[PDB]
Amino acid sequence: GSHMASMKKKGSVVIVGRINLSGDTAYAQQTRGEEGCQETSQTGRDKNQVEGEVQIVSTATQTFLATSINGVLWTVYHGAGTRTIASPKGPVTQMYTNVDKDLVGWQAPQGSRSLTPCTCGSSDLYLVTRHADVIPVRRRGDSRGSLLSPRPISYLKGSSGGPLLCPAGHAVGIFRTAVCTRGVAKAVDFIPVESLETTM
Ligand SMILES: CC(C)(C)[C@@H]1NC(=O)O[C@@H]2CCC[C@H]2OC/C=C/C(F)(F)c2nc3ccccc3nc2O[C@@H]2C[C@@H](C(=O)N[C@]3(C(=O)NS(=O)(=O)C4(C)CC4)C[C@H]3C(F)F)N(C2)C1=O
Numbered sequence: 649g650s651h652m653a654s655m656k657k658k659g660s661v662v663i664v665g666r667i668n669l670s671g672d673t674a675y676a677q678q679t680r681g682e683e684g685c686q687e688t689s690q691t692g693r694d695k696n697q698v699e700g701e702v703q704i705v706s707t708a709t710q711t712f713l714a715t716s717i718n719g720v721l722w723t724v725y726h727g728a729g730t731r732t733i734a735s736p737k738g739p740v741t742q743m744y745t746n747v748d749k750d751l752v753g754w755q756a757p758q759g760s761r762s763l764t765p766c767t768c769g770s771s772d773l774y775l776v777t778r779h780a781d782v783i784p785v786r787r788r789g790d791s792r793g794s795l796l797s798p799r800p801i802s803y804l805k806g807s808s809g810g811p812l813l814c815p816a817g818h819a820v821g822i823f824r825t826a827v828c829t830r831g832v833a834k835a836v837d838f839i840p841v842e843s844l845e846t847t848m
């Protein structure tokens with residue numbers, strides 16, 4: 649509009665949970681409910697303890713994932729836009745933004761753990777979803793991989809920003825898009841970890 653004094657400000661991305669991969673079982677944990685998420689988005693002040701590599705994140709209108717690799721919390725631009733992330737000291741500005749790669753990054757929150765970029769050159773990958781499903785994916789190109797067991801896109805919705813990992817648990821990529829036939833996701837496209845390492 650033309651009245652700057654009443655123009656609104658978009659809130660921060662807020663960590664609302666995590667995918668726990670510490671033990672023998674992968675499972676999602678929620679760490680903040682909808683009400684606290686809304687307040688934290690407006691203030692940008694998040695005093696909750698952060699743990700793990702894969703965070704569940706939310707805005708006022710979307711929920712997706714964010715993954716720490718080499719001390720950067722990475723996610724997709726189509727989820728985060730240019731938004732700050734909430735942190736204990738106030739909103740934190742993105743350190744990386746690349747709409748051409750559908751990629752953004754913030755400094756990894758204190759308490760998080762980072763994945764190591766994969767150097768194995770392995771093509772047997774594993775996609776981790778927001779429901780803590782571990783989905784075998786065969787790498788088919790620099791940025792594409794096929795699901796060994798296709799499933800409706802509904803099962804992958806909300807998992808952009810999640811990791812594809814190698815057999816050793818290294819980060820190979822950041823889940824970006826699905827490739828579907830009749831609503832069934834047969835393959836995925838991801839931001840390769842090398843494209844991250846270049847951005848850095
Ligand atoms: C048909 C389809 C499956 C919906 C779509 N496929 C598709 O486009 O495939 C083509 C063919 C192979 C590569 C790809 O080239 C196009 C590149 C798209 C892009 F990624 F570069 C992208 N750049 C943007 C930049 C600025 C603003 C918006 C942008 N929007 C984009 O893509 C958009 C969004 C992305 C998305 O849905 N991601 C996921 C997800 O969970 N999101 S999310 O968490 O729910 C949520 C929306 C909250 C954040 C993983 C897939 C889940 F559902 F499985 N899209 C559309 C798709 O996957």
Ligand SMILES: [Zn+2]
Pocket residue numbers: 765766767768769770814815816817818
């Ligand atoms: Zn590896």
